Coordinates of C-alpha atoms in Angstrom, one line a residue:
X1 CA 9.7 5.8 5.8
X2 CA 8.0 3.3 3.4
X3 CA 5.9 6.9 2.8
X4 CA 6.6 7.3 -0.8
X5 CA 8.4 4.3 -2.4
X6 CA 5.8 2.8 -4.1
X7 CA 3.1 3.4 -6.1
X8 CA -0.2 2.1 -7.7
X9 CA 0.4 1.6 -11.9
X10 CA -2.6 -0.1 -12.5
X11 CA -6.5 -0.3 -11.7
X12 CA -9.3 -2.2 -12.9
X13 CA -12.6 -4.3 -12.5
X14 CA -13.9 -7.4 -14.0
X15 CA -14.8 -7.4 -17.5
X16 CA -19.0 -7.6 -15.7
X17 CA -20.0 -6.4 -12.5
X18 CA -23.6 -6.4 -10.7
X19 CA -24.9 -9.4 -11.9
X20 CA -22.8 -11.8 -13.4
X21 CA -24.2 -15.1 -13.3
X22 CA -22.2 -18.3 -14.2
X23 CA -19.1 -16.8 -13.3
X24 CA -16.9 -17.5 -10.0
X25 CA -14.9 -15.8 -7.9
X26 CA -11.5 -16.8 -9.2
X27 CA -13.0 -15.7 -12.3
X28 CA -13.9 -12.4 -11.3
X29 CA -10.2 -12.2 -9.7
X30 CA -8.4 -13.2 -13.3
X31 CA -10.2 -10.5 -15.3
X32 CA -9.4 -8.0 -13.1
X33 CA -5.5 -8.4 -12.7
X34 CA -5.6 -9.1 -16.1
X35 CA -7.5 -5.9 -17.2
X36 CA -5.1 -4.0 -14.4
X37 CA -1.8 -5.4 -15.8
X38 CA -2.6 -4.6 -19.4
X39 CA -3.4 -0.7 -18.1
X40 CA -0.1 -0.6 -16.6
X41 CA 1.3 -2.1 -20.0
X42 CA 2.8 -5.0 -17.8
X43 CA 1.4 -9.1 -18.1
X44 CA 1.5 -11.7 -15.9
X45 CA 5.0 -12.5 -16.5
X46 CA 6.2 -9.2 -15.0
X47 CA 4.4 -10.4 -11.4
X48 CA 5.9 -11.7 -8.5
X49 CA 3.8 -10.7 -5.3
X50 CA 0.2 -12.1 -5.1
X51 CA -2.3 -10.7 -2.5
X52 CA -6.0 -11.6 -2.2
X53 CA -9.4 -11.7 -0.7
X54 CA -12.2 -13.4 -1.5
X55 CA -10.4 -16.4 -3.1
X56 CA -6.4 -18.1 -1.6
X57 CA -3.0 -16.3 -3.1
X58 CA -2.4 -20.4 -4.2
X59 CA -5.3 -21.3 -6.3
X60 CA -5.1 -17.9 -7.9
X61 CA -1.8 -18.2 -8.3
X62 CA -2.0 -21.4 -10.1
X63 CA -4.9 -20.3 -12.0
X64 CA -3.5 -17.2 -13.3
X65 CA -0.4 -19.8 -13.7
X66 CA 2.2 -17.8 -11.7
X67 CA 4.8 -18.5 -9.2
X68 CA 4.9 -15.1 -7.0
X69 CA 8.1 -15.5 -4.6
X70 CA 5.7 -13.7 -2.2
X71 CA 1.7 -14.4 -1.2
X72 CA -0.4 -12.6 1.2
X73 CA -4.0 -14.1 1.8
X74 CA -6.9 -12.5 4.0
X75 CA -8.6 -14.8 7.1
X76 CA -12.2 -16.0 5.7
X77 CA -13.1 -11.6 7.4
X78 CA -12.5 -7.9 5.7
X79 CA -9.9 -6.6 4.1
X80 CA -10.0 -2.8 2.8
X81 CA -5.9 -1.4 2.5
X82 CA -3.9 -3.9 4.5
X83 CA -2.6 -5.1 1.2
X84 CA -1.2 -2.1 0.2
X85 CA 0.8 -1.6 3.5
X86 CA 1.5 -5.4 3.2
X87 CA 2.9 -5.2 -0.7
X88 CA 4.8 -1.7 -0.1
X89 CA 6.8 -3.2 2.5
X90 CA 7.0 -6.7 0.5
X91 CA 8.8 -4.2 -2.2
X92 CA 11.1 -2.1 -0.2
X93 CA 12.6 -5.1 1.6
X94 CA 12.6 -6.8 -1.8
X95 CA 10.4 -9.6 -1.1
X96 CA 8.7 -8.8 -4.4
X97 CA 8.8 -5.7 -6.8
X98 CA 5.7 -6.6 -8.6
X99 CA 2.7 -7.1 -6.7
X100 CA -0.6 -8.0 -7.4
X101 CA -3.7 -7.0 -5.5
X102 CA -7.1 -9.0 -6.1
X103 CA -10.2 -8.6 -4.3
X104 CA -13.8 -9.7 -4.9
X105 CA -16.5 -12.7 -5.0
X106 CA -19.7 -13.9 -6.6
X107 CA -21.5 -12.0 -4.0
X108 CA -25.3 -11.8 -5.9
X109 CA -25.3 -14.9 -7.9
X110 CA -22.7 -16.9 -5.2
X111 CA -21.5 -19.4 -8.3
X112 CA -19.6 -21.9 -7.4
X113 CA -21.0 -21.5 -3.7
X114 CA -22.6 -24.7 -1.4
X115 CA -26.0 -24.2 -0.7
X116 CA -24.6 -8.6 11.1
X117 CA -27.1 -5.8 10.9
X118 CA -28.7 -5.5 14.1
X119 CA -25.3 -4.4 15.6
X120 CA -25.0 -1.2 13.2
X121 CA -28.4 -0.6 13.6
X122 CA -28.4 -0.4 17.1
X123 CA -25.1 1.5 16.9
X124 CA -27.0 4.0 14.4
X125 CA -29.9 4.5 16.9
X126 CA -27.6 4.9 19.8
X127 CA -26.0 8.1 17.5
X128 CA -29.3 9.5 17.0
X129 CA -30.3 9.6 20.4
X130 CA -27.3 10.8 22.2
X131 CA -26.4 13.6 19.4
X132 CA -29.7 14.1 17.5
X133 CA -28.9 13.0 14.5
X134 CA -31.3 12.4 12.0
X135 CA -32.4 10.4 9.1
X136 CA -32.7 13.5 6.7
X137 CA -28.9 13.5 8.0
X138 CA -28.5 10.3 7.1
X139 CA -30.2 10.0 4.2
X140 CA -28.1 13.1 2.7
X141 CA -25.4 10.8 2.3
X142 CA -27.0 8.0 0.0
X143 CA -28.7 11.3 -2.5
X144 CA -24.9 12.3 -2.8
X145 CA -23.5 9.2 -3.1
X146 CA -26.3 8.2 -5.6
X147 CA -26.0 11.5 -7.6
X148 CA -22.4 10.1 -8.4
X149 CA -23.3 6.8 -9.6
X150 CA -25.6 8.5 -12.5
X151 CA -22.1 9.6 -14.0
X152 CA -21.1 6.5 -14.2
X153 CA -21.9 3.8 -16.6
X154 CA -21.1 0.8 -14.5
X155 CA -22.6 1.6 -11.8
X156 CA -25.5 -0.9 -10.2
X157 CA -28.0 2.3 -9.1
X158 CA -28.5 4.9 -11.8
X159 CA -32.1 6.1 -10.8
X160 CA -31.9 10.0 -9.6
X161 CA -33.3 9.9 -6.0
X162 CA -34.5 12.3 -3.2
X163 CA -34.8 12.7 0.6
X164 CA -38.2 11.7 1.0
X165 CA -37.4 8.4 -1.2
X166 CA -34.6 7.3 1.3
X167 CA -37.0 8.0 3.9
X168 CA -40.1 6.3 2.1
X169 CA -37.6 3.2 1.0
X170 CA -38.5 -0.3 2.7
X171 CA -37.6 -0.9 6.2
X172 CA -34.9 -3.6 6.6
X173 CA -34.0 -3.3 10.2
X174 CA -34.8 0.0 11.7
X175 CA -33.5 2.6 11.6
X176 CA -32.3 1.4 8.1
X177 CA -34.4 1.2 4.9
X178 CA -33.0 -0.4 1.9
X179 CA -31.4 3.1 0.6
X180 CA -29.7 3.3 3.8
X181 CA -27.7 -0.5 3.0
X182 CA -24.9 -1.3 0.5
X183 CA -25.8 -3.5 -2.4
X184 CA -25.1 -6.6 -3.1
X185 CA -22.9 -7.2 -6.6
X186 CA -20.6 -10.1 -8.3
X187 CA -17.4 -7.7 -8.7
X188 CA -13.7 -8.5 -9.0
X189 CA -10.8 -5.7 -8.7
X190 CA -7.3 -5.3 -8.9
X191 CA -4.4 -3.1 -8.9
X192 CA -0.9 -3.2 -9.6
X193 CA 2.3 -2.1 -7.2
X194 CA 5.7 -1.3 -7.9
X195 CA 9.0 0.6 -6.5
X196 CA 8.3 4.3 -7.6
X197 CA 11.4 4.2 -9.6
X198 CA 9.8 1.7 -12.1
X199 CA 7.0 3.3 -12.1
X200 CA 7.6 6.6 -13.7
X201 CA 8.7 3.9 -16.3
X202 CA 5.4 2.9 -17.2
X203 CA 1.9 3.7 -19.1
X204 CA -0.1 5.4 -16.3
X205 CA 0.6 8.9 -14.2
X206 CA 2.2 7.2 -10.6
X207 CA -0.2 6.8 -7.4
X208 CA 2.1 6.8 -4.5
X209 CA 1.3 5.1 -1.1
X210 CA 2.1 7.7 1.0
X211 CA 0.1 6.7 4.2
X212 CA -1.1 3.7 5.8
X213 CA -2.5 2.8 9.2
X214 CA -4.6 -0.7 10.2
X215 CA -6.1 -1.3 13.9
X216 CA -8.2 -3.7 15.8
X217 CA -9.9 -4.1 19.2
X218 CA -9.0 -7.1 20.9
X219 CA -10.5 -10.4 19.8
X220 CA -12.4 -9.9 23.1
X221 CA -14.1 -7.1 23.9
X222 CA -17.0 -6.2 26.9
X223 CA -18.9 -4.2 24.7
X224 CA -19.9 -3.7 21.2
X225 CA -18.6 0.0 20.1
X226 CA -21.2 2.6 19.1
X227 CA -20.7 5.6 19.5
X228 CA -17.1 5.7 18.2
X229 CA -14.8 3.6 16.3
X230 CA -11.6 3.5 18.8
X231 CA -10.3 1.4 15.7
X232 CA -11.2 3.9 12.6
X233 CA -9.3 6.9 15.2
X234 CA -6.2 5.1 15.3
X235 CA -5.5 4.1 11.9
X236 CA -7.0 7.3 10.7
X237 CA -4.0 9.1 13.0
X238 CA -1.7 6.7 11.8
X239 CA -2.3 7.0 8.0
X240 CA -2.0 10.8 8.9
X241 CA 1.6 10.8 10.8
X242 CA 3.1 8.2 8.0
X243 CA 2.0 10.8 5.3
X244 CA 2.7 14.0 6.9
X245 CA -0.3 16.0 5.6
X246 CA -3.6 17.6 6.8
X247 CA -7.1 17.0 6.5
X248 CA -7.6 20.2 4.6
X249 CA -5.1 19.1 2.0
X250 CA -7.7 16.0 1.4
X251 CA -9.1 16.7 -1.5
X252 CA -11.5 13.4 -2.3
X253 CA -12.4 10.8 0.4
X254 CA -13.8 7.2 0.0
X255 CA -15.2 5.6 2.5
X256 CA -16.5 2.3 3.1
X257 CA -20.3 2.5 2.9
X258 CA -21.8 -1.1 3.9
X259 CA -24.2 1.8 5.7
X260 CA -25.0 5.2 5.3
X261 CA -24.1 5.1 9.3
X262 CA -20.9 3.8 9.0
X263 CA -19.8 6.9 6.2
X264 CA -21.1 9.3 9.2
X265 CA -19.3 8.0 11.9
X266 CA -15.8 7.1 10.1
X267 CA -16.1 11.0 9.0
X268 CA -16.5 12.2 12.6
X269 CA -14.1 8.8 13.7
X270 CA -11.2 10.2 11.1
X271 CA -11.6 13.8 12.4
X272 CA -13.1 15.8 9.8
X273 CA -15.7 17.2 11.5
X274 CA -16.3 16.9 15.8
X275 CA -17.8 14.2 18.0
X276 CA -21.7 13.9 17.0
X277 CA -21.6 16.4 14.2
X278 CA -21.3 14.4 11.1
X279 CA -25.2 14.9 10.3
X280 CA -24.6 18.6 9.8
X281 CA -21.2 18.1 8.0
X282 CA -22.9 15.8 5.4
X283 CA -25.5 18.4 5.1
X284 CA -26.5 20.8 2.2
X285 CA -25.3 18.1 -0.3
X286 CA -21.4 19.0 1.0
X287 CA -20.3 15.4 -1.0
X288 CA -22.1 15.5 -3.7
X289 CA -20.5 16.3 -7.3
X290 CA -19.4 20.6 -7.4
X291 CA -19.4 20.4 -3.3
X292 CA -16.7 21.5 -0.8
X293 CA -16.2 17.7 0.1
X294 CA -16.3 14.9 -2.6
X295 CA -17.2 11.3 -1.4
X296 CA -17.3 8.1 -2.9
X297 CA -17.1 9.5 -6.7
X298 CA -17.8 5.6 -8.4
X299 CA -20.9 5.8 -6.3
X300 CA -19.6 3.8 -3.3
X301 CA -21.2 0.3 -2.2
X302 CA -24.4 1.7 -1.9
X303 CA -25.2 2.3 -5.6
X304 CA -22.2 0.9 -7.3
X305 CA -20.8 -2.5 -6.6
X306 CA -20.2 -4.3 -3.5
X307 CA -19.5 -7.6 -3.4
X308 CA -18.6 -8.3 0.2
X309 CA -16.2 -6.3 2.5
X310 CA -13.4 -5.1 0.2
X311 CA -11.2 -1.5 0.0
X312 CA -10.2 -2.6 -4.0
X313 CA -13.2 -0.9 -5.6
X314 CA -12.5 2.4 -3.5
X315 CA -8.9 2.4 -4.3
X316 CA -9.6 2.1 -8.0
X317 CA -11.6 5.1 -7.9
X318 CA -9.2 7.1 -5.8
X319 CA -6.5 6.1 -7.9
X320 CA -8.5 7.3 -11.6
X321 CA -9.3 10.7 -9.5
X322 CA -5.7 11.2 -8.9
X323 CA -5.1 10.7 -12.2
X324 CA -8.1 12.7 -13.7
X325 CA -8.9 9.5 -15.5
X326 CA -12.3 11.5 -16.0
X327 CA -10.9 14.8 -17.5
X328 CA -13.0 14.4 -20.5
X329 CA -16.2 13.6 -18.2
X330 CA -17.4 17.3 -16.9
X331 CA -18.4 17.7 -13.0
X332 CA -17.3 13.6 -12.7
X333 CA -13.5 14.4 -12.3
X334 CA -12.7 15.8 -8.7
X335 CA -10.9 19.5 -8.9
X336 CA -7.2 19.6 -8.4
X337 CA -6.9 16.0 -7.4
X338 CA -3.6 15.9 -5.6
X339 CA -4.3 13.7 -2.5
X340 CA -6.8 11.1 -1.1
X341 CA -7.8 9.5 1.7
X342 CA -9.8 5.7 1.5
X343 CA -11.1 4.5 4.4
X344 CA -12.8 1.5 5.3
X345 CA -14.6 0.6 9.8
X346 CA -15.3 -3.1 9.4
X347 CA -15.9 -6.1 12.2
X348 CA -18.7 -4.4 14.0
X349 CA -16.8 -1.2 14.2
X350 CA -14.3 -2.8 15.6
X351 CA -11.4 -2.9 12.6
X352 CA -10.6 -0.6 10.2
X353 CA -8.2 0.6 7.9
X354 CA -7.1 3.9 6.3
X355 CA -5.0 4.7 3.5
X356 CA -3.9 8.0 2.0
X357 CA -2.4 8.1 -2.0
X358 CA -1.2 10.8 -3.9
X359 CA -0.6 12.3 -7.4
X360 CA 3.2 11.9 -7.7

């Protein structure tokens, strides 16, 4: 019952992303609520929840010079849609009815900054040997994802690429080559929540928060997940019930892509294909722009941005596809954007987060 009474007015980056050197992370944070607020055709004045990661809700706060009645900060740890559950609720209950969401650091050039792999990698092999997945499978998934950072300008990777190049790429930790891992960027992003109500009083078509579900295994645990995300399951189901809709009416999905292992398994973890058979369901370029199942549409961490482990940049793009910010853009714009699903399996698949937004 918090399904529905609020809703995303406002959604930007930084004025730079990739490589912005010189610049910190409260920096990067500023721009972006800035550039966010002015989209909504609200300032700083209007703001009075702050929620961040990447940099403290009180040194933003006082850099941005505001006074929110209500702060939400993330441990220094990931952070993908917690604050969207966190600022709905801080609205309904009228802790706030204007709240800011920041994410981002100086991930590349780490201004301002004093002078794990194996465990997804291992998780990645043990998938390949118990269901046969492969690393043309695999590999599918950064071609796609690639294929939809060429239409757009900002994106980090432009460079069309093939199977055989993901295959041919440099080894990092095996099974991963370097096509197969995120990127590393200097990005800030924001976006701006309000009551519903207000928010068919302002500039932009609403997004509504219309599902959210967050889970974690306890802080200890016997064995490091592989096979499954037990976490990813639940606050996929949860995200689900709160919204009350199916997986066919899902009509774009973003998900977290630190690896191209981690977008298989939360897609088999969230129920969208079966146990073992995200290889094949990623197949036949299925997520690519014009397929049956469009997938990370700003081109994801893995040629985009990604400055650390943050849902803001996939919630900016969900948010523009719902309101077919790209209408003018051809094959860009997802068809009949009515509902999306962001997703993000952190920890060492041992958190995660899911979120599901609509076109009010």
């Amino acid at each position: 019952t918090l399904s529905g009474k609020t809703a995303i007015v406002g959604v930007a980056e930084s004025d730079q992303i990739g490589k912005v050197p010189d610049k910190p992370a409260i920096a990067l944070h500023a721009e972006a609520a800035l550039n966010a607020l002015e989209e909504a055709g609200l300032t700083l004045r209007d703001v009075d929840g702050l929620l961040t990661a990447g940099i403290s809700p009180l040194e933003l706060g006082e850099y941005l010079g505001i006074e929110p009645s209500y702060t939400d900060g993330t441990a220094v740890g990931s952070s993908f849609v917690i604050h969207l559950a966190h600022a709905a609720a801080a609205i309904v209950t009228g802790r706030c009815s204007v709240a800011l969401i920041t994410h981002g650091e100086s991930g590349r050039s780490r201004v301002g900054m004093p002078p794990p792999v194996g465990a997804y990698a291992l998780a990645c092999s043990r998938h390949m040997a118990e269901y046969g997945t492969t690393k043309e499978q695999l590999a599918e998934i950064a071609v796609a994802t690639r294929k939809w950072a060429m239409l757009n300008p900002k994106a980090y990777m432009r460079d069309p690429i093939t199977i055989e190049d993901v295959l041919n790429s440099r080894p990092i930790v095996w099974p991963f080559n370097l096509l197969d891992c995120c990127l590393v960027t200097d990005a800030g992003g924001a976006c701006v929540v309000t009551s519903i109500e207000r928010a068919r009083d302002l500039r932009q078509h609403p997004v509504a928060i219309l599902g959210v579900g967050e889970s974690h295994d306890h802080s200890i645990i016997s064995q490091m997940p592989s096979l499954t995300s037990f976490a990813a399951r639940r606050s996929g189901q949860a995200a689900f019930k709160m919204a009350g809709v199916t997986h066919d009416d899902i009509d774009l999905a973003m998900i977290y892509d630190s690896f191209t292992y981690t977008v298989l398994l939360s897609l088999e973890d969230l129920g969208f294909c079966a146990k073992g058979e995200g290889g094949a369901f990623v197949s036949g370029q299925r997520t690519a722009p014009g397929g049956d199942f469009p997938m990370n549409t700003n081109g994801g961490g893995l040629s985009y941005t990604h400055p650390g482990m943050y849902g803001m940049f996939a919630i900016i793009e969900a948010v523009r596809q719902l309101r077919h910010d790209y209408a003018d853009q051809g094959i860009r714009q997802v068809p009949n954007c009515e509902l999306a699903i962001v997703h993000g399996t952190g920890g060492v698949l041992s958190s995660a987060g899911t979120a599901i937004l609509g076109r009010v």
